[PDB]
Design an enzyme around this catalytic site. Structure first.
Site, PDB file in Angstrom:
ATOM      1  N   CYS A  42      33.675 -13.423 -17.160  1.00 35.07           N
ATOM      2  CA  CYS A  42      33.393 -11.861 -17.264  1.00 35.07           C
ATOM      3  C   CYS A  42      32.812 -11.388 -18.647  1.00 35.07           C
ATOM      4  O   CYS A  42      33.637 -11.241 -19.285  1.00 35.07           O
ATOM      5  CB  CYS A  42      34.454 -11.141 -16.372  1.00 35.07           C
ATOM      6  SG  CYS A  42      34.174  -9.331 -16.010  1.00 35.07           S
ATOM      7  N   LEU A  43      31.637 -10.713 -18.388  1.00 36.84           N
ATOM      8  CA  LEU A  43      31.238 -10.187 -19.772  1.00 36.84           C
ATOM      9  C   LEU A  43      31.907  -8.846 -19.968  1.00 36.84           C
ATOM     10  O   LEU A  43      31.988  -8.545 -21.316  1.00 36.84           O
ATOM     11  CB  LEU A  43      29.840  -9.931 -19.261  1.00 36.84           C
ATOM     12  CG  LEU A  43      28.958  -8.908 -20.019  1.00 36.84           C
ATOM     13  CD1 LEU A  43      28.316  -9.243 -21.507  1.00 36.84           C
ATOM     14  CD2 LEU A  43      27.709  -8.115 -19.243  1.00 36.84           C
TER      15      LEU A  43
END
Length: 150
Positions: free
Chosen positions: A82-83
């Site tokens: 997840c960015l």
């Protein structure tokens, strides 16, 4: 003449990491990562796909687990981390080595079932942490054993 785009991967080599550039790009490489000790990830080995964007180090690197990694903040199919959770830790002063030495072991030890990329893992973890970790341990045996990448 030397950017962080160009040279940062060398710090991983200096740190003792086994890594391979993809098509002679200094911004695209696969690095070997060992599961943190005393976690459900212990004894696991993963190949991790790192790319550095053209606005690195102001933009953070992308990280993708190439063999199966079970975690609320990791996309189960693609292995993509997840960015948003990367960006909560990444600053322009953060070290590429610390992504592997600090960020990822931390993340794997203390997941965030808030806005999960893997909601099944988030749910299981919310319901029963021990049952969840028994799953991870078997996933690690199955999908991240020593011999997998040779």
């Amino acid at each position: 003449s030397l950017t962080r785009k160009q040279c940062d991967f060398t710090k991983l080599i200096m740190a003792g990491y086994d890594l391979e550039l993809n098509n002679g790009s200094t911004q695209d490489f696969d690095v070997m990562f060992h599961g943190p000790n005393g976690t459900a990830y212990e004894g696991g080995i993963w190949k991790v796909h790192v790319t550095l964007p053209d606005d690195y180090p102001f933009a953070s690197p992308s990280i993708g687990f190439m063999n199966k990694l079970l975690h609320p903040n990791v996309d189960e199919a693609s292995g993509s981390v997840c960015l948003d959770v990367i960006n909560q830790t990444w600053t322009p002063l953060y070290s590429l080595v610390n992504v592997f030495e600090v960020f990822l072991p931390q993340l794997l030890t203390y997941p965030n079932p808030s806005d999960p990329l893997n909601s099944d893992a988030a749910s299981l973890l919310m319901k029963d942490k021990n049952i969840y970790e028994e799953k991870v341990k078997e996933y690690v045996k199955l999908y991240a054993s020593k011999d997998l990448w040779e």
